[PDB]
Amino acid sequence: RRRVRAILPYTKVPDTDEISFLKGDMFIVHNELEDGWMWVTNLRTDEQGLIVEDLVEEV
Amino acid sequence: MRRRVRAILPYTKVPDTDEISFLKGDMFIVHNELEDGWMWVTNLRTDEQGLIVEDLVEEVG
Protein backbone atom coordinates (compact mmCIF):
# COMPACT_ATOMS: atom_id res chain seq x y z
CA ARG A 1 0.00 0.00 0.00
CA ARG A 2 1.02 3.63 -0.91
CA ARG A 3 2.86 4.25 -4.17
CA VAL A 4 4.70 1.41 -5.94
CA ARG A 5 7.13 1.57 -8.87
CA ALA A 6 7.58 -0.87 -11.75
CA ILE A 7 10.96 -2.61 -11.65
CA LEU A 8 10.49 -4.00 -15.18
CA PRO A 9 8.25 -3.30 -18.19
CA TYR A 10 5.19 -5.44 -18.85
CA THR A 11 2.79 -6.08 -21.72
CA LYS A 12 -0.70 -7.23 -20.74
CA VAL A 13 -2.35 -10.50 -21.65
CA PRO A 14 -5.07 -9.73 -24.23
CA ASP A 15 -8.69 -9.76 -23.09
CA THR A 16 -7.89 -9.17 -19.42
CA ASP A 17 -7.94 -6.02 -17.36
CA GLU A 18 -4.21 -6.09 -16.75
CA ILE A 19 -2.50 -2.90 -17.84
CA SER A 20 0.81 -2.72 -19.68
CA PHE A 21 3.55 -0.51 -18.26
CA LEU A 22 7.20 0.53 -18.47
CA LYS A 23 9.98 0.29 -15.91
CA GLY A 24 9.94 3.34 -13.66
CA ASP A 25 6.17 3.80 -13.90
CA MET A 26 4.47 4.83 -10.64
CA PHE A 27 1.17 3.40 -9.38
CA ILE A 28 -1.33 4.19 -6.64
CA VAL A 29 -2.75 1.02 -5.06
CA HIS A 30 -6.54 0.91 -4.67
CA ASN A 31 -7.05 -2.76 -3.80
CA GLU A 32 -4.73 -5.58 -2.82
CA LEU A 33 -6.14 -8.86 -4.08
CA GLU A 34 -5.25 -12.50 -3.46
CA ASP A 35 -2.09 -14.02 -4.96
CA GLY A 36 -0.17 -10.75 -5.21
CA TRP A 37 -2.53 -8.96 -7.58
CA MET A 38 -3.44 -5.30 -7.17
CA TRP A 39 -5.99 -2.93 -8.69
CA VAL A 40 -4.10 0.31 -9.35
CA THR A 41 -3.87 3.53 -11.36
CA ASN A 42 -0.76 4.15 -13.47
CA LEU A 43 0.21 7.79 -12.80
CA ARG A 44 1.83 8.22 -16.24
CA THR A 45 -1.05 6.94 -18.37
CA ASP A 46 -3.92 7.39 -15.88
CA GLU A 47 -5.05 3.86 -16.74
CA GLN A 48 -6.70 1.73 -14.06
CA GLY A 49 -6.03 -1.98 -14.06
CA LEU A 50 -4.46 -5.04 -12.50
CA ILE A 51 -0.70 -5.47 -11.93
CA VAL A 52 1.21 -8.09 -9.95
CA GLU A 53 3.44 -7.46 -6.92
CA ASP A 54 6.34 -9.38 -8.46
CA LEU A 55 6.94 -6.54 -10.92
CA VAL A 56 6.88 -3.54 -8.58
CA GLU A 57 8.57 -2.23 -5.44
CA GLU A 58 7.77 0.17 -2.60
CA VAL A 59 8.92 3.77 -3.04
CA MET B 1 -4.78 -11.95 -13.85
CA ARG B 2 -8.13 -11.70 -15.79
CA ARG B 3 -11.12 -9.33 -15.99
CA ARG B 4 -13.49 -6.87 -14.37
CA VAL B 5 -17.31 -7.04 -14.52
CA ARG B 6 -20.02 -4.62 -13.30
CA ALA B 7 -23.26 -5.25 -11.42
CA ILE B 8 -26.38 -4.20 -13.32
CA LEU B 9 -28.63 -4.77 -10.29
CA PRO B 10 -28.20 -5.03 -6.50
CA TYR B 11 -28.22 -8.24 -4.48
CA THR B 12 -28.38 -9.13 -0.78
CA LYS B 13 -26.56 -12.33 0.18
CA VAL B 14 -28.27 -15.24 1.89
CA PRO B 15 -27.15 -14.87 5.53
CA ASP B 16 -24.17 -16.94 6.69
CA THR B 17 -23.13 -18.08 3.22
CA ASP B 18 -20.16 -17.31 0.98
CA GLU B 19 -22.27 -15.09 -1.27
CA ILE B 20 -21.50 -11.39 -1.06
CA SER B 21 -23.88 -8.45 -1.24
CA PHE B 22 -23.52 -5.69 -3.79
CA LEU B 23 -25.08 -2.62 -5.42
CA LYS B 24 -25.75 -1.72 -9.04
CA GLY B 25 -22.53 -0.34 -10.47
CA ASP B 26 -20.16 -2.27 -8.19
CA MET B 27 -17.02 -3.49 -10.00
CA PHE B 28 -15.65 -7.01 -9.45
CA ILE B 29 -12.47 -8.83 -10.43
CA VAL B 30 -13.31 -12.35 -11.55
CA HIS B 31 -11.20 -15.15 -10.07
CA ASN B 32 -13.21 -18.22 -11.15
CA GLU B 33 -16.13 -18.80 -13.50
CA LEU B 34 -18.17 -21.71 -12.20
CA GLU B 35 -20.12 -23.71 -14.78
CA ASP B 36 -23.22 -23.43 -12.58
CA GLY B 37 -23.56 -19.78 -13.57
CA TRP B 38 -21.84 -18.42 -10.45
CA MET B 39 -18.38 -16.93 -10.02
CA TRP B 40 -15.84 -16.39 -7.26
CA VAL B 41 -14.89 -12.71 -7.29
CA THR B 42 -13.70 -9.73 -5.27
CA ASN B 43 -15.92 -6.64 -4.99
CA LEU B 44 -13.61 -3.64 -5.48
CA ARG B 45 -15.85 -1.31 -3.47
CA THR B 46 -16.10 -3.47 -0.35
CA ASP B 47 -13.01 -5.65 -0.83
CA GLU B 48 -15.13 -8.69 -0.03
CA GLN B 49 -14.41 -11.95 -1.84
CA GLY B 50 -17.21 -14.42 -2.50
CA LEU B 51 -19.85 -15.85 -4.81
CA ILE B 52 -22.07 -13.82 -7.18
CA VAL B 53 -24.38 -14.80 -10.04
CA GLU B 54 -23.30 -13.96 -13.57
CA ASP B 55 -26.87 -12.93 -14.44
CA LEU B 56 -26.50 -9.80 -12.32
CA VAL B 57 -23.34 -8.50 -13.99
CA GLU B 58 -22.20 -7.27 -17.39
CA GLU B 59 -18.82 -7.12 -19.14
CA VAL B 60 -16.85 -3.87 -18.87
CA GLY B 61 -14.84 -2.22 -21.62
The full set of domain ranges for chain B reads 2-61
- Residues of B within 8 A of A21 (CB-CB) are none
| A-contacting residues in B 1-60 (Cβ below 8 Å) | 1-4, 29, 31, 42, 44, 47, 49, 60
Q: How does DSSP classify residue A13?
A: P
Pick the CATH number of B2-61 from 2.60.120.10, 3.40.50.620, 3.90.79.10, 2.30.30.40: 2.30.30.40
Closest-CA distance of chain A to residue B43, Å: 10
Alpha carbon distance B1, A16 (integer Å): 7
Technique used to solve these coordinates: X-ray
Burial of B46 (0-12, 13-18, 19+ CB in 10 A): middle
Order the strands of the A26-32 sheet from edge to edge.
A48-52, A37-42, A26-32, A3-6, A56-58
